[PDB]
């Protein structure tokens, strides 16, 4: 299938004393495999998946060094943004950065991305051609001018199209027993009275990987969104995910409704009906 490698960085400034709090996480598809927390004791990139533990000390020395460089960049960014926006040294502010690459079924480059946010809103993003920048406001336009002159986008495109993709293949091969397996949802249907006239049908999807999935309700073979509730896909905590979709129906009419489940791990969509 398709795969992606993505990195998420968050820096939260602390007024009053000291350095900002910085956290970094790295993902292949929906699996976290590395992390860094400036508040933890090791002060190293630490593993979070078994297939990355096998990498040697040269890797962990490089990753740690680069992630501390990232943290120092965000430290400076927070200082400069406070200046651009004329804000006081009293408030607490956030910078977030995310970048990565997707490969297709053939494992060749499909797409790369790199975006930045300040206080939770778009600041500057790399366009889909990896050649220019999207700037949300005038502060960010000044950054756009710094970066076009320093040719950051060019430097960034080499990584996304090249290095990012190479290591993604490497990770996919070593974690192949996990990263290259699909886990089909385990599905069932439960029933809960909500009065003397109504009943809830809840259609469950458990223990599936990856997290993309679609659950839809039908009545007499036609789509139904009225009186349906669909919760956000949630992590089970063991690496897999969960989801459910519910419909309120009139007691005695449960049989008219069917739940339909689509997932990469299923050769065909599943169909579920209530059974007494």
């Amino acid at each position: 299938g398709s795969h992606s490698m993505r990195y998420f960085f968050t820096s939260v400034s602390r007024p009053g004393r000291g350095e900002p709090r910085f956290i970094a996480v790295g993902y292949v598809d929906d699996t976290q495999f590395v992390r860094f927390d400036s508040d933890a004791a090791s002060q190293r990139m630490e593993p979070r998946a078994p297939w990355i533990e096998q990498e040697g000390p040269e890797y962990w020395d490089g990753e740690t060094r680069k992630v501390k460089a990232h943290s120092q960049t965000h430290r400076v960014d927070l200082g400069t943004l406070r200046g651009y926006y004329n804000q006081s040294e009293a408030g607490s502010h956030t910078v977030q950065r995310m970048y990565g690459c997707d490969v297709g079924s053939d494992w060749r480059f499909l797409r790369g991305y790199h975006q930045y946010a300040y206080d939770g809103k778009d600041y500057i993003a790399l366009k889909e051609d990896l050649r220019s920048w999207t700037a949300a406001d005038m502060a960010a336009q000044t950054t756009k001018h710094k970066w076009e002159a320093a040719h950051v986008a060019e430097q960034l495109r080499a990584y996304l199209e090249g290095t990012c993709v190479e290591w993604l293949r490497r990770y996919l091969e070593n974690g192949k027993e996990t990263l290259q397996r699909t886990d089909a949802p385990k599905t069932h249907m439960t029933h809960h009275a909500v009065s003397d006239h109504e009943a809830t049908l809840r259609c469950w999807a458990l223990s599936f990987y990856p997290a993309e999935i679609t659950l839809t309700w039908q009545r007499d073979g036609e789509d139904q969104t009225q009186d349906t509730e669909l919760v956000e896909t949630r992590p089970a905590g063991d690496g897999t995910f969960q989801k459910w979709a519910a419909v309120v129906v009139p007691s005695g009419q449960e049989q008219r409704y069917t739940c339909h489940v689509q997932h990469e791990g299923l050769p065909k969509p599943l169909t579920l009906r209530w059974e007494p």
């Binding site: 990195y7 970094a24 790295g26 490089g62 990753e63 680069k66 992630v67 460089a69 990232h70 960049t73 400076v76 960014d77 400069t80 943004l81 651009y84 970048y99 930045y116 600041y123 500057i124 950054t143 710094k146 970066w147 320093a150 950051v152 430097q155 960034l156 990584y159 290095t163 990012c164 290591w167």
Partner: peptide, 10 residues
């Protein structure tokens, strides 16, 4: 493998 090199300022 995170980006290697001089990550410029904003």
């Amino acid at each position: 493998y995170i980006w290697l090199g001089f990550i410029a300022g904003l």
